[PDB]
Design a protein around this ligand. Structure first.
Ligand SMILES: Cc1cc2nc3c(=O)[nH]c(=O)nc-3n(C[C@H](O)[C@H](O)[C@H](O)COP(=O)(O)OP(=O)(O)OC[C@H]3O[C@@H](n4cnc5c(N)ncnc54)[C@H](O)[C@@H]3O)c2cc1C
Ligand SMILES: *n1c2c(c3ccc(Cl)cc31)C[C@@]13CN4CCC[C@]4(C[C@H]1C2(C)C)C(=O)N3
Ligand SMILES: CC1(C)c2[nH]c3cc(Cl)ccc3c2C[C@@]23CN4CCC[C@]4(C[C@@H]12)C(=O)N3
Ligand SMILES: [Cl-]
Ligand SMILES: [Zn+2]
Length: 664
C-alpha cells in the first residue's frame, strides 16, 4: 500500500483542533448523533475494547457511540499486556508484525527478590514468553493503544467522539426501550449540550466510576492498601551493567521486597507527535495489516516516524507499588520537592540493589506534558458494589481494581469488557421486542451472572495481590511459592483454541488462576501466617520453611492432576519438567534478541530478518530460536501449526478451560 496523508492534510487545510481531526474519521459524522443503541462513557482501553468486541461479535446490529472527555487519547498508567490481550488483537485482525511497530516487545515475567536485612543478596524467578511464530506480548503506550483502537473502531462502524464529556448530572438512565437520554457537552462551561437518545449506557469511566458511584458507595477491602509513585526514564541500549544476573529488558521486570515491588517496562513513546500525523500512520499500518504485508517489507518504527513526521523514542516506565502501612520519615525534602519524587528517591536509597539498578537510567522530564515527571496515586484497590441496572452496566476499572502486579487491570479486566459487549446485543433486542416490565425483568436475570462474576472477581484478585505481596517478604517464598503458584494456576491452557465467539467465556474462566482451589489454599496459609509478623520484622526462618513445605506438598498433587502437556523446564529457568525447584538451573528457551543497532528487543523467526524498530538487517539469528531441551524439526513445525489461525466457531465443541485439570 502507498502511504496516504489524509488526516495530516485535512487538519492543515481546515486548521482543525485535535478533537476535530479525530472526530472527522467517524462513520456517522464529526457531530454527535441524535440517537444510538449504545452510548459508552469513556474511551479508555476498556471502552474501546467493549465497542470493538461488540461490533466484531455481531456486526451491523448495534449503533455505538463512545464519548471521551480527552481531546486526544490521553496518558494512562497501565502498559503491560499478556497473551490473552494479544490473542484478542490477533482475533480482531492485527497480529504481531504490525503491533510491534507501535508497541514494545514483551518476553516473560521476571522477578528479583531483594533481601532487606542482607543488602545486596537477591534471588530471582525467570520466565520466557513464546516463539515469534507462536505469539507475542506487548508493552503499550496508552495514548497509542487508545488511538489504535479508536481508528479501528471508526473503521468498523463505531463512532468515537473525543473532546466530549458525558454530563452525569443531567443524563437520564432508565429502563424501557430507548429510555436513556445521555447529555454530552464539551465541559462544565458548555451551555449547549447535546442529547443522545439511546437504549444502553456503558460506564467505562474507569476508577472515576462516574455513573455507578451514584448507585453504591465505593467499597474498600480490609487490611492495608497500596500506593504507587512512578516516572519515566531512558532505556539503555547496553543492559550489561544492570546489577541482576541474566537480566533482559523485554521482560516485565519486578524488583520485589518486603514493602512492595518496582515495575520496569521498556516501551517506545510517540510523545511529541501531532495527532493527525499519528492517525495517518495508524491508518497506514491497518491497511498493511489488511493486505497482509510481510514483516520484512513493512517499514520499521523509525521509518514510520520519518514517513509521517512523528517523534519516536525508547523509554523505561519505572514505578513503586508499596503497602500503605509503610512508615516514612516526616521530612523527605532531601529527596525532592514533590511527594511522588520524594518517596520514589527515598525508596531507591533504602535498597542498594535498587540504587545500583536505577543508576543505569536517566530521568526524563515531563514526558507527557508539564507536571508529568512524577506521578503518585494512593489507595489503589477498590470495588464497585453495583455494576449494572435498568439501562446501564459498567466495565473495566469502573467495576473495580486491585494492583498493577501481574497486570490484571487490562488483561483480566477485559473479561468484563468483552462479556458486556456480547451481552449488549440481546440486552438491546430485548428492550426493542418486549413491553417494558418484562424486558426489564429479563435483562436483569440475564445480567445476574455478570453481576455475580464481578462481585467475586475483585476479592479474588485482592487475595491474589496479598498472596504475592506477603511472599515478597522472603527471597524463597517469592519465587518458589507465589510466582510458582501464579504461573501454574494462571497459565492460559488451550488459548490457541479461542476465537471471537468463545473469547468472553474463556476470559471469565481465567482470572489469572486466582479462583483455582489449591491456589487459594496456599494463598490463605501464607497470608494467615505472614500478616501476623510486623512489616518492619524479618520472617522467622521456621515460618518460611513451613510455608514452603506446605506449598510444595499441595503443588505436587495439583501438578500431577493437570493433564496439560507443557515443557515447564523450558519456560521457567529455575524449575524442572515437574515444576520442582532446581537450585542452579540456568537452561531455558530463547525467543528474543536485542538489535545491535538500536537496542530494541526482537522476536526470533526466519521470516523477520530485519529489526522491526530501526530496519537494521540481522545476520542469521532468526531461525536461531533456542529450544532447551531441544525440539525436533517435526515438533517445532507442530508447535507453529497450532498457533497459525484460530479455529472457526463450532457451537457443538465445549470450551476447554485455561485452569488446571481438577483431580478425580
Ligand atoms: C500504578 C498503576 C500501574 C498499573 N499497571 C498496569 C499494567 O502494567 N498492566 C495492566 O494491565 N494494568 C495496569 N494498571 C491498571 C490499568 O491502569 C487500568 O486497569 C486501566 O487503565 C483501566 O482502563 P479503563 O478503560 O477501565 O479506564 P481508563 O483508561 O482510566 O479510562 C477512563 C476514561 O473515561 C474518561 N472519562 C471520565 N469521565 C468522563 C465523562 N464524564 N465523560 C466522558 N469521558 C469520561 C477519561 O477521560 C478516561 O479516558 C495499573 C494501574 C495503576 C494505578
Ligand atoms: N456457560 C455457558 C455459556 C456461557 C457463556 C458465558 C459464560 Cl460467563 C458462561 C457460560 C454458553 C454455552 C457454551 N456451551 C457450548 C456448548 C453448549 C453450551 C452451553 C453454554 C454454557 C451453559 C456452558 C452452549 O451452547 N452455550
Ligand atoms: C501459554 C503461553 C501463552 C504462556 N503463558 C504464560 C504465563 C506465564 Cl505467567 C509465563 C509463561 C507463559 C507462557 C509461555 C508459553 C507456553 N506455551 C508452550 C506452547 C505454546 C506456548 C504459549 C505460551 C509458548 O510458546 N510459550
Ligand atoms: Cl505482567
Ligand atoms: Zn534496530
Amino acid at each position: 500500500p502507498t502511504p496516504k496523508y489524509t488526516f495530516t492534510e485535512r487538519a492543515a487545510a481546515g486548521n482543525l483542533s485535535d478533537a476535530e481531526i479525530l472526530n472527522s474519521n467517524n462513520p456517522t459524522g464529526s457531530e454527535l448523533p441524535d440517537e444510538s443503541d449504545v452510548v459508552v462513557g469513556g474511551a479508555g482501553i476498556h471502552g474501546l475494547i467493549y465497542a470493538l468486541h461488540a461490533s466484531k461479535y455481531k456486526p451491523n446490529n448495534l449503533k455505538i457511540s463512545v464519548i471521551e472527555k480527552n481531546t486526544r487519547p490521553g496518558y494512562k498508567i497501565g502498559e503491560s499486556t499478556l497473551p490473552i490481550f494479544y490473542t484478542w488483537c490477533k482475533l480482531h485482525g492485527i497480529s504481531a508484525a504490525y503491533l510491534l511497530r507501535l508497541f514494545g516487545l514483551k518476553d516473560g515475567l521476571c522477578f528479583y527478590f531483594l533481601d532487606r536485612e542482607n543488602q545486596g543478596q537477591y534471588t530471582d524467578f525467570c520466565s520466557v514468553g513464546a516463539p515469534g511464530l507462536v505469539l507475542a506480548s506487548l508493552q503499550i503506550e496508552r495514548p497509542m493503544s487508545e488511538l489504535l483502537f479508536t481508528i479501528l473502531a471508526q473503521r468498523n462502524g463505531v463512532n468515537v467522539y473525543h473532546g466530549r464529556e458525558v454530563d452525569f448530572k443531567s443524563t437520564v438512565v432508565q429502563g424501557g426501550g430507548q429510555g436513556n437520554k445521555i447529555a454530552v457537552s464539551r465541559g462544565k462551561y458548555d451551555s449547549t449540550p447535546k442529547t443522545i437518545d439511546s437504549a444502553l449506557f456503558v460506564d467505562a469511566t474507569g476508577r472515576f466510576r462516574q455513573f455507578c458511584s451514584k448507585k453504591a458507595p465505593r467499597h474498600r477491602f480490609d487490611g492495608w492498601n497500596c500506593n504507587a509513585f512512578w516516572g519515566y526514564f531512558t532505556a539503555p541500549k547496553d543492559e550489561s551493567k544492570i546489577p541482576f544476573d541474566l537480566y533482559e529488558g523485554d521482560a516485565t521486570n519486578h524488583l520485589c521486597f518486603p514493602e512492595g515491588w518496582v515495575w520496569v517496562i521498556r516501551l517506545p513513546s510517540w510523545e511529541g507527535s501531532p495527532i493527525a500525523n499519528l492517525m495517518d500512520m495508524v491508518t497506514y499500518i491497518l491497511e498493511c495489516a489488511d493486505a497482509g504485508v510481510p514483516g520484512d517489507e513493512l517499514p520499521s518504527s523509525e521509518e514510520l516516524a520519518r514517513m509521517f513526521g512523528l517523534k519516536f523514542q525508547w523509554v523505561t516506565s519505572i514505578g513503586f507499588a508499596v503497602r500503605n502501612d509503610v512508615k516514612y520519615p516526616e521530612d523527605l525534602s532531601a529527596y525532592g520537592t514533590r511527594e511522588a519524587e520524594q518517596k520514589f528517591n527515598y525508596f531507591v536509597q533504602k535498597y542498594e540493589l535498587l540504587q545500583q539498578f536505577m543508576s543505569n537510567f536517566e530521568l526524563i522530564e515531563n514526558l507527557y506534558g508539564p507536571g508529568t515527571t512524577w506521578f503518585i496515586r494512593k489507595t489503589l484497590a477498590y470495588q464497585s458494589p453495583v455494576v449494572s441496572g435498568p439501562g446501564w452496566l459498567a466495565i473495566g476499572d469502573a467495576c473495580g481494581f486491585t494492583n498493577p502486579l501481574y497486570s490484571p487491570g487490562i488483561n483480566v479486566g477485559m473479561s468484563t469488557s468483552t462479556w458486556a459487549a456480547q451481552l449488549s446485543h440481546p440486552i438491546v433486542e430485548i428492550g426493542k421486542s418486549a413491553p417494558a416490565d418484562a424486558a426489564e425483568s429479563s435483562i436483569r436475570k440475564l445480567l445476574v451472572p455478570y453481576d455475580d462474576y464481578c462481585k467475586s472477581l475483585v476479592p479474588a484478585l485482592e487475595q491474589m495481590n496479598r498472596f504475592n505481596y506477603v511472599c515478597y517478604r522472603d527471597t524463597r517464598l517469592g519465587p518458589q511459592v507465589a510466582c510458582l503458584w501464579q504461573f501454574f494456576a494462571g497459565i492460559e491452557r488451550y488459548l490457541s483454541d479461542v476465537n471471537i465467539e468463545t473469547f468472553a467465556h474463556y476470559a471469565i474462566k481465567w482470572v489469572w488462576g486466582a479462583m483455582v482451589p489449591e491456589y487459594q489454599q496456599v494463598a490463605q496459609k501464607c497470608i494467615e501466617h505472614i500478616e501476623t509478623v510486623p512489616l518492619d520484622e524479618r520472617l522467622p526462618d521456621a515460618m518460611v520453611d513451613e510455608l514452603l513445605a506446605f506449598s510444595n506438598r499441595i503443588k505436587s498433587a495439583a501438578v500431577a492432576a493437570d493433564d496439560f502437556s507443557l515443557r515447564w523446564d523450558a519456560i521457567l529457568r529455575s524449575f524442572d519438567r515437574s515444576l520442582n525447584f532446581v537450585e542452579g538451573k540456568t537452561s531455558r528457551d530463547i525467543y528474543t534478541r536485542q538489535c545491535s543497532g538500536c537496542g530494541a528487543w526482537l522476536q526470533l523467526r526466519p521470516d523477520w530478518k530485519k529489526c522491526h524498530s530501526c530496519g537494521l538487517l540481522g545476520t542469521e539469528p532468526q531461525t536461531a530460536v533456542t529450544f532447551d531441551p531441544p525440539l525436533t524439526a517435526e515438533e517445532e513445525a507442530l508447535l507453529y501449526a497450532a498457533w497459525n489461525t484460530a479455529p472457526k466457531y463450532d457451537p457443538s465443541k465445549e470450551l476447554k478451560l485455561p485452569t488446571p485439570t481438577r483431580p478425580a
